[PDB]
Design a protein around this ligand. Structure first.
Ligand SMILES: [Fe+3]
Ligand SMILES: [Fe+3]
Ligand SMILES: [Fe+3]
Ligand SMILES: [Fe+3]
Lengths: 307, 307, 307, 307
């Protein structure tokens, strides 16, 4: 079935100490999150650059890692019910806060953790290049050659287009209908590895370290080993849902060239351009497209998705 | 059928002279071992690092070869009957001892050669990337597409997780049942190339250069061209079997990222975590996981295994 | 009386940060251990090298500290009853775990903490070179000149031969009789500072950070300030006792030359060689001899020993 | 059908000028050879090294190109009838001599051009990694999945073991029977790309620039633009056939590791070792194994071979 998605977002200093700290803290956080039976996996991203749209963002390029002073992380966790995410954080708060707070020394902005529902998904299981022979053999043995997927390689061996959209109130249905038609046509582009549309349903205050006064002071004063009061979150997840409605169009690609020209198919192929124009007519903001590297991931979230 | 496994273990200086000596002496030892008809192949490993488990072993990394002052070798030989290994050593002692003793100038610890029975094996034949087209065609022509394996590349083009376990006396059946259930579920991870469970049955004194007093002095005094008395081994293979019972869980992977996150599936995927927890409850020691490079190998041992 | 000995073993990166951490954390751990009235002292060792036995381990030398990428520690704590060690760990768990876990960032292997009984001891009190005049005067005034010991200098000013043995099941009495006869003759070598024979009685799971599943996850997920459940150790100390039976022959020497040629007396002096040959005939493994520097120590453990 | 093979052999200075002239002269010679309708293709090799057989040739390694002062070339041309090669040389002598003579400035030894019959061949068509999808589709459409070959990549993207043998007079039948059995078993080795056995039938005097006195002086005196008398070759091809009988066992491999351990299967796998021992018992010389890079080739010779 379709899981819910929590996306923990933050900006940190782009230096080895940041990546060293992620190598030790990151796995621990994932192991704590896996204590909850509603956890179905994760996909953690480093932003490597920004899609320039020709020279609309002429100061950007798809890989800015050599020049950038910061690194943005977008850490997806997948949940049977979005309430499982909230329960997990509270049930494991003493571990989670102390682990997550240990990254504060590198932090420039965040954490900010919106929660999303998946309204469309065309996402395959990941396979390494070593696996495809057995996948093909099994699918043919089952008489299901149409179920043979593209090779979507895990652990940093593909790239993600993370396309931010906000929609004019009252045009959500037009946006959703047109973006699904767009993605159904986009899958013909070479190197397309899958797409999904995420629709924001709210924000996790506890995952964003957004408390009332009491917890705010406890966060600011923390030596690192004392939990803020997890009951001092002042709003539920849906209370923080944004209007204009926010969406993420998440598209995976074999490499950054396939991403650039593949996403570009909505501008360059006349039939698709007419369809995608219906998306553009509904927007308050966007599309703004971040280029992401999916490095650490728990690939079994796609097994839950595809049943 | 399942062969027995002898694993010759040693630690040597990490310097070019060590790898030069292995390039010339190593093949000679393998050729002598192949004189016995019970020999069914071999798989020789260099340890490249240690799995850090987040930062549980924070001084370790999966590839420590650039910094390490030593190199550990784990040389598997496969036998129709473990007694064939003992007979081979004695029948060819003048060659084997003089070849193996020539390594002494580089040696820091070893040799130590435990013997194992295989209690579980899910291991494919090795294939190079050039081979899969013919393998696929042959299996389909035979009507056995389910027998098409993953591509497990020989000669250093994959990695091994070598997981050491010792088990509380009386919990061996619980360990064995649970680890098999774990490995049957682990094979869904991307880049999984196979697994087997080795259970120690004893130690080869002659393969470990472990003699009584007479042979000990002959080893220490040796100019290099005089054999110690091979009859001066004071214990049979089973007499040295350890209690607590020792196991090796040997899992092969496409690359070190697939290894790290694939092995991590027993921690990150809740359903598998519950199964693997039954393994953890039985342990005196472990899991301690060495990262191995299978460089020199006689791949036909898997043909014997898979018949 | 003879205390029991717990030996905490670990391997860490050989870099200044490791020795800095030991200079601050080490004393803290010792002070916590001293909270228990059954604690009678300690003797902490750095391995400086390996005895090469001519060129049997030709890649080794007695001092490998300049080249080695790792450092092995062997931390002896002495106890009136071995159960005191287990009680101390649990009574002081919140301090001990957090202190010991702070070493994890430097750790490659360990901790592993076997427990031993002393079956033979000929070990003097330590004295500095400044002390011997008062020791001599006191012993003569008491009419006990035979109780004047050799000068065994504390705090890194002597060396230890740490000789590992494992014994064929059924040959333990032969080993023990012969090694005692050997050590009674070895004390004639110049620079001999004492010897003792340690016989393994089990392993401390809590001291080895070896828990069931619950504690294992708590260790891996730990931010550093949360204790694993100390009741989640799944085995008692005796349940982990190894067969083949393990022994440590611990011999102290004025310097590494006295060690090399003094230990060599069991090979070079014919009458002693015949006696020590009876030891060699009983072995599954060994002798493998580590060269240790006893740097930080609580010398009063020898006062308890010698009453 | 099986073509005949002419192998032009020479040794030249290992310097850029040699490879420059080969980049210009080599294609011209091949274009001239293709003027004859009996020409069915070619496969030109650079020797990159020598198989050391452990340390039997301890001064050798499989890739000596960085240290070698010379480069050996082995240029295979394939012919419907070996007489076609002789006719081609004479019909096109003014071009061929002047082209081939232009390499003399770099030459140390050669040219020497023995002629061979193929007595056994298991050689696939070459395919690039881009081609295999269409090859698989075509073979399944023909209902012949057993005809799907391994991927044997052209133009320097595989390696050749060139194994020289000379056979005791009267043992030719034993050699030929046993080598065919050996190669039929060797094809199980990973990365095996094909094998063929070439049996010398004679030597091309004209291709070897081996004339009588008249042509010898014309070669030595040549300014580069005057042909020696092509009728001054004093021996026919069969008149130069060697006794002891010479063979080449030509085996192709995915890479040099697959070659080393794959060819080693005749020494390391007991069942194959027994078969290959029947080859060894017949030899005057060899096996001596050159490691070759097949760079420039006309791959259609395998289309002729395979019908
Ligand atoms: Fe969260
Ligand atoms: Fe052996
Ligand atoms: Fe302890
Ligand atoms: Fe020719």
């Amino acid at each position: 079935p379709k899981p819910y998605v929590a996306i923990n977002m933050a900006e940190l200093k782009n230096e080895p100490k940041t990546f060293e700290m992620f190598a030790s803290v990151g796995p621990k956080v994932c192991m704590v999150t896996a204590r909850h039976p509603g956890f179905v996996g994760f996909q953690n991203h480093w932003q490597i650059g920004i899609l320039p749209f020709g020279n609309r963002y002429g100061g950007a390029k798809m890989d800015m890692t050599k020049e950038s002073s910061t690194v943005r992380v977008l850490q997806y966790t997948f949940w049977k019910d979005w309430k499982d995410h909230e329960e997990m954080h509270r049930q494991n708060w003493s571990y989670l806060f102390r682990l997550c707070y240990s990254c504060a020394s590198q932090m420039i902005w965040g954490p900010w953790e919106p929660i999303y529902e998946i309204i469309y998904a065309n996402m395959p299981i990941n396979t390494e290049m070593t696996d495809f022979t057995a996948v093909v053999g099994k699918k043919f043995a089952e008489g299901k050659p149409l179920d043979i997927p593209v090779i979507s390689q895990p652990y940093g061996k593909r790239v993600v287009a993370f396309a931010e959209h906000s929609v004019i109130p009252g045009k959500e249905k037009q946006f959703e209908d047109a973006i699904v038609r767009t993605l159904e046509m986009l899958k013909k582009a070479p190197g397309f590895l899958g797409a999904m549309v995420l629709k924001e349903i709210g924000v996790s205050g506890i995952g964003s370290m957004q408390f009332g006064a009491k917890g705010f002071h406890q966060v600011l004063e923390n030596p690192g080993s004392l939990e803020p009061d997890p009951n001092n979150v002042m709003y539920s997840v849906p209370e923080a849902k944004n209007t204009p409605q926010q969406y993420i169009v998440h598209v995976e690609w074999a490499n950054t060239d396939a991403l650039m020209f593949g996403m570009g198919r909505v501008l360059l192929y006349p039939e698709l351009r007419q369809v995608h124009d219906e998306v553009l007519d509904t927007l308050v903001y966007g599309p703004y497209i971040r280029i992401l590297n999916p490095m650490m991931e728990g690939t079994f979230w796609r097994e839950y998705l595809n049943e």
